[PDB]
Design a protein around this ligand. Structure first.
Ligand SMILES: Nc1ncnc2c1ncn2[C@@H]1O[C@H](COP(=O)(O)OP(=O)(O)OP(=O)(O)O)[C@@H](O)[C@H]1O
Ligand SMILES: [Mg+2]
Lengths: 438, 349
């Protein structure tokens, strides 16, 4: 059944009366900051002021039944004015891969809170929400509320430091759920379901390369299912229930596969385990022979998902390369290999496309391994030293100035795109540009 | 009783006390003296008629029989308590072997009969002492120095950096350079004298090179120190050349990176989205971070290595010498920590 004409209006009106103008304003501030990650505090606050204004008036028992329609329409028109007071999209708000929000020291927090409680609370909800806005709305509302409650009680406590430790430990579960859901949902948003599923399988393969496909494939699918369902859900506890539940399945499956997972699964709480497994770097890949692309048959025969997942798993667990690189070349490669099945002379298409893709893949991997050379096996300062020595030998001609410049650009690239959790959107475009230099 | 005990077993000093207190009640040298037996200060004062051994090296327990002697002394002689009556929180160095933790636990339950206990990571307790659960700790004591990045209580194991240079090496270096200046410090007694000079007169120069130039002439940096026999000596640039070794390990022939670089490298092993929270919560803990000027120098060095738009904040409280113990005191006192204790029941299981 299709929702009634006044679904939206009646939905908002209900939450306004149920929460109260103050709590409704807080809800709106979080909701719109989340919607416009790039909006300034001024812009978002003004928009929220208008929204709350029309909501209060248009929801009044006995108010113009058509009040909400126009007021909201005029609001959208007011956003048209170039350089309007409201924030705007270029619709779609890109995920924030580089949050800049920094929590002040306990002393700074309390001084600021004492000077202007209301301003402090609004500024916090705005800055936090615009930085971690991909986390489900319900988690953001709950987290900011609990955080502010902690600030209120601890700053006026007889022993602030003790109170802060106590409340931060109690806030831990929710803090992690909020921060982690923002990150995995940001990567899901950037990738889309199909690529997210591939990426997650790749990361599991690198973390536990000694496992069987049957141990990791269901885990990759479960996390993908949870993200497609819970990230943009309005449910008040989709993510809060699913994430922790995923952690139990992860440990039941991998707690004995290697020392690192055994240690992670010894953590006391579900979110403690998730954080440990999320931050876990790729393991040292065992040495194994090369893996050839799937045969013409295994590619064209109906129901090939398992064959492709297995290839993904086999290639990932033996190829020393970051996930952002593997995900980037693996999807076009498998897609192209499948373009052959649609032709009358499939075999002919395979004899010319098979060798071509095999070389394009080997090449990509080689250029990627060069771009990330020495990064994962050394401390950063030591890595930069070996880089300078490698580039010098490669460019005996370059001046000291030029070499220094190259070292800085390459090491900067590596510090951003050669790790297991490198940012997908940023690295996709950076890898393209950096590949043309080799 | 109902008061939990907190014991921070350091390479050089044992810090022990009761949960809830703002400072350790007992602080003594982690040494055991055999007749050629005593423990702590009494062993040091009688070192002439005994042989000294240090059960803890580089923060890791290496001699269990001697460690039991230190713990027994801590409970009965220093704290004057009966172990059987108090839950006990112990500390361990970052990356302490699992088998080590297991042995500590076994000894506490079977030898001392404690009713409950817990083993916490020293660096994490230093962070908790400041009422935070995320940040990077530079912990430098008498035998070892570590950088430990922590996110909501979880210390990232692959990002932990360890520098085999600490207080003891700084004392030996000050002895060396004071000797090159004309004085003579070689005996064990003279080593204790030098340690006192180090703790009282050394400091970290903001700009090492410039400070060296300033000392080359003026005496505005020189200070006097009265020896036991009353002789008054002068300490000049040795004041800041000593701790400079933390930033330049080459001063003692070590090829390793200095503490500003291990801090930076530690942060770089962490995901890009949480680095900002490490840079903004860099905690210093331990006796070897007590040098005046060290925080400002670290601020400067890290700023030069990090992105220009990164906020750098160094947290170095006046009581940081005991931050580990203090963090343990607060943690062990939390109502929500009472479920973390490993009970004797659960152990006999
Ligand atoms: N004010 C001070 N300035 C410089 N060094 C100091 C100062 N006070 C103490 N120290 C040095 O700190 C060391 C004692 O610190 P600490 O108690 O933190 O070490 P520890 O816990 O015993 O050992 P570790 O943690 O390395 O195992 C000694 O080398 C001591 O000389
Ligand atoms: Mg210590």
């Amino acid at each position: 059944l299709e929702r009634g004409r006044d679904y939206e209006k009646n939905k908002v009106c209900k939450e306004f009366s149920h929460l109260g103008k103050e709590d409704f304003t807080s809800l709106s501030l979080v909701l719109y900051s989340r919607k416009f990650p790039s909006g300034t505090f001024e812009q978002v606050s003004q928009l929220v002021k208008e929204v709350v204004s029309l909501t209060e008036a248009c929801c009044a028992e006995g108010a113009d039944p058509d009040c909400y329609d126009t007021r909201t329409s005029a609001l959208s028109a007011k956003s048209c004015e170039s350089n309007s007071p409201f924030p705007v999209h270029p619709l779609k708000h890109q995920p924030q891969e580089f949050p800049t929000y920094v929590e002040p020291t306990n002393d700074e927090i309390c001084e600021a809170f004492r000077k202007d409680p209301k301003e402090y609370a609004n500024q916090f909800m705005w800055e936090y929400s615009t930085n971690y806005g991909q986390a489900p709305l319900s988690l953001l509302v709950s987290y900011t509320k609990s955080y502010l409650s902690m600030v209120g009680s601890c700053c006026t406590s007889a022993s602030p430091t003790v109170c802060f430790l106590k409340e931060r430990l109690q806030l831990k579960h929710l803090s992690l759920l909020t921060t982690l859901s923002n990150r995995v949902c940001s990567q899901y948003a950037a990738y889309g379901e199909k690529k997210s599923r591939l990426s997650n399988l790749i990361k599991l393969a690198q973390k536990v390369p000694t496992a069987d496909l049957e141990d990791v494939l269901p885990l990759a699918e479960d996390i993908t299912n949870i993200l497609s369902k819970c990230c943009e859900s309005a449910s008040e506890d989709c993510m809060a229930k699913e994430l922790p539940e995923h952690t139990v399945k992860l440990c039941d499956n991998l707690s004995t596969k290697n020392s690192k997972f055994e240690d992670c699964c010894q953590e006391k709480t579900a979110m403690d385990v998730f954080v440990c497994t999320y931050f876990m770097p790729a393991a040292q890949l065992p040495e194994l022979p090369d893996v050839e692309l799937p045969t013409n048959k295994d590619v064209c025969d109906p129901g090939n998902t398992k064959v492709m997942d297995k290839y993904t798993f086999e290639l990932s667990r033996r190829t020393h390369l970051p996930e952002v690189f593997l995900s980037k070349v693996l999807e076009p490669t498998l897609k192209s290999l499948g373009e052959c099945c649609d032709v009358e002379d499939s075999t002919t298409c395979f004899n010319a496309k098979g060798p071509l893709l095999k070389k394009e893949l080997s090449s990509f991997i080689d250029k990627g391994q060069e771009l990330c050379a020495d990064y994962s096996e050394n401390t950063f300062t030591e890595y930069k030293k070996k880089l300078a020595e490698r580039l010098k030998a490669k460019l005996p001609d370059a001046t000291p100035k030029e070499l220094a410049k190259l070292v800085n650009k390459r090491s900067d690239f590596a510090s951003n795109c050669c790790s297991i959790n490198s940012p997908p959107l940023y690295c996709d475009s950076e890898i393209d540009a950096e590949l043309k230099n080799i | 009783e109902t008061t939990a005990l907190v014991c921070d077993n350091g390479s050089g000093l044992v810090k022990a006390g009761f949960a809830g207190d703002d400072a350790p009640r007992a602080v003594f040298p982690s040494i055991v003296g055999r007749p050629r037996s005593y423990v702590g200060d009494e062993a040091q004062s009688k070192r002439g008629i005994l042989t000294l051994k240090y059960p803890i090296e580089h923060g890791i327990i290496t001699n269990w029989d001697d460690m039991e002697k230190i713990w027994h002394h801590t409970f009965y002689n220093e704290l004057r308590v009966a172990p059987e009556e108090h839950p006990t929180l112990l500390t361990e160095a970052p990356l302490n072997p699992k088998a080590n933790r297991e042995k500590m636990t076994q000894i506490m339950f079977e030898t001392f009969n404690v009713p409950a206990m817990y083993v916490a990571i020293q660096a994490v307790l230093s962070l908790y002492a400041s009422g935070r659960t995320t940040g990077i700790v530079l912990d430098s004591g008498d035998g070892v120095t570590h950088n430990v990045p922590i996110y909501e209580g979880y210390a990232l194991p692959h990002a932990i950096m360890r520098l085999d240079l600490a207080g003891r090496d700084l004392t030996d270096y000050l002895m060396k350079i004071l000797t090159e200046r004309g004085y003579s410090f070689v005996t064990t007694a003279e080593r204790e004298i030098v340690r006192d000079i180090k703790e009282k007169l050394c400091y970290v120069a903001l700009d090492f090179e410039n400070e060296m130039a300033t000392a080359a002439s003026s005496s505005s940096l020189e200070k006097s120190y009265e020896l036991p026999d009353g002789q008054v000596i002068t300490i000049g640039n040795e004041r800041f050349r000593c701790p400079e070794t933390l930033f330049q390990p080459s001063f003692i022939g070590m090829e390793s990176a200095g503490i500003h670089e291990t801090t930076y490298n530690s942060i770089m092993k962490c995901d890009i989205d949480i680095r900002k929270d490490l840079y903004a919560n860099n905690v210093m803990s331990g006796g070897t971070t007590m040098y005046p000027g060290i925080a400002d120098r670290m601020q400067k060095e890290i700023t030069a290595l990090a992105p220009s738009t990164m906020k750098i904040k160094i947290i170095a409280p006046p009581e940081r010498k005991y931050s580990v113990w203090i963090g343990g005191s607060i943690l062990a006192s939390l109502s929500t920590f009472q479920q973390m204790w490993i009970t004797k029941q659960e152990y006999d299981e």
